[PDB]
Design an enzyme around this catalytic site. Structure first.
Site, short mmCIF file in Angstrom:
data_model
loop_
_atom_site.label_atom_id
_atom_site.label_comp_id
_atom_site.label_asym_id
_atom_site.label_seq_id
_atom_site.Cartn_x
_atom_site.Cartn_y
_atom_site.Cartn_z
N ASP A 65 3.78 -12.69 -7.09
CA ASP A 65 3.20 -11.69 -6.20
C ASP A 65 2.01 -11.14 -6.99
O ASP A 65 2.16 -10.31 -7.89
CB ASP A 65 4.18 -10.56 -5.86
N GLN A 78 0.85 -1.19 0.00
CA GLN A 78 0.00 0.00 0.00
C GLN A 78 0.89 1.25 0.00
O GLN A 78 0.55 2.26 -0.61
CB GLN A 78 -0.95 0.03 1.21
N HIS A 100 4.66 -12.01 -1.92
CA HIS A 100 4.47 -10.62 -1.51
C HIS A 100 5.27 -10.31 -0.24
O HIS A 100 5.59 -9.15 0.03
CB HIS A 100 2.99 -10.33 -1.27
P1 DPE Z 1 0.08 -4.49 1.22
O1 DPE Z 1 -0.76 -3.15 1.30
C1 DPE Z 1 -1.01 -5.63 0.83
C2 DPE Z 1 -2.11 -5.20 -0.14
C3 DPE Z 1 -2.88 -6.38 -0.70
C4 DPE Z 1 -4.13 -6.67 0.12
C5 DPE Z 1 -5.33 -5.89 -0.39
C6 DPE Z 1 -6.63 -6.60 -0.07
C7 DPE Z 1 -7.49 -5.77 0.88
C8 DPE Z 1 -8.81 -6.47 1.19
C9 DPE Z 1 -8.60 -7.79 1.91
C10 DPE Z 1 -9.92 -8.47 2.22
C11 DPE Z 1 -10.05 -9.76 1.43
O2 DPE Z 1 0.80 -4.76 2.65
C12 DPE Z 1 1.74 -5.81 2.86
#
Ligand code: DPE
Length: 197
Positions: free
Chosen positions: A159, A105, A172
């Site tokens: 990823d 993020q 990831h």
């Molecule tokens: P990164 O910000 C991980 C981002 C990916 C996750 C996004 C999904 C959000 C909704 C989840 C509910 C199913 O930090 C490591």
């Protein structure tokens, strides 16, 4: 450790030559998270403790997992927070070379902030590193309004966030080695390209 506020705490009369602004991933601690400290240690080794200021994006940036689903991959409040830090750096230390980075993020936040930044400040960011860039596919591996040569994206095979999804898979969480070597190597190289040595 996981919290560094060198820019906010720093004395304007004794500005560092390099200022690094970093945004952590979702649910991570402090303002640097898991990858930030590793990058910081290596930058300090290259420029000296007094030569570089490490600043994590805290304040309004809560690194809330759900915000990954918002239009820009993060909240408007978070973007305002990071923009504010770039502006503080520019005001407090006009001659410092800036560098930036973000994970997950935080990578989307870094991209959004840089895209919205006033060109005069954006042009001072000598290099930016993005790990597990959530808007990798959507932005074609670039940061809008920012040169490709100053950008380095670390996106592991497998990823899913790098391929247009928001699913969190094992790859990831495997950016440790990159944060310890190639990421700081790139940042150091980009700073030296413009500042000399
Ligand atoms: P990164 O910000 C991980 C981002 C990916 C996750 C996004 C999904 C959000 C909704 C989840 C509910 C199913 O930090 C490591």
């Amino acid at each position: 450790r996981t919290t560094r506020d060198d820019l906010i705490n720093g004395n304007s009369a004794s500005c560092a030559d390099v200022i690094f602004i970093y945004a952590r991933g979702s649910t991570e601690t402090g303002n640097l998270g898991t990858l930030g400290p590793s990058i910081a240690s290596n930058l300090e080794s290259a420029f000296g403790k007094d030569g570089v200021w490490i600043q994590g994006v805290g304040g309004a940036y809560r690194a809330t997992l759900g915000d990954n689903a918002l239009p820009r991959g993060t909240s408007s409040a978070a973007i305002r927070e990071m923009l504010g830090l770039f502006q503080q750096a520019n005001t407090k230390c006009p001659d410092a070379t800036l560098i930036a980075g973000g994970y997950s993020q935080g990578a989307a936040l870094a991209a959004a902030s840089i895209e919205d930044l006033d060109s005069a400040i954006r042009d001072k960011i000598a290099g930016t590193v993005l790990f597990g860039y959530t808007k990798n596919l959507q932005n074609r591996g670039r940061i809008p309004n920012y040169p490709a040569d100053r950008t380095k994206v670390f996106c592991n095979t497998g990823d899913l966030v790098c391929t247009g999804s928001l699913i969190v898979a094992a790859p990831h969480l495997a950016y440790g080695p990159d944060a310890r070597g190639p990421a700081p190597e790139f940042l150091i190289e980009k700073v030296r390209a413009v500042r000399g040595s």
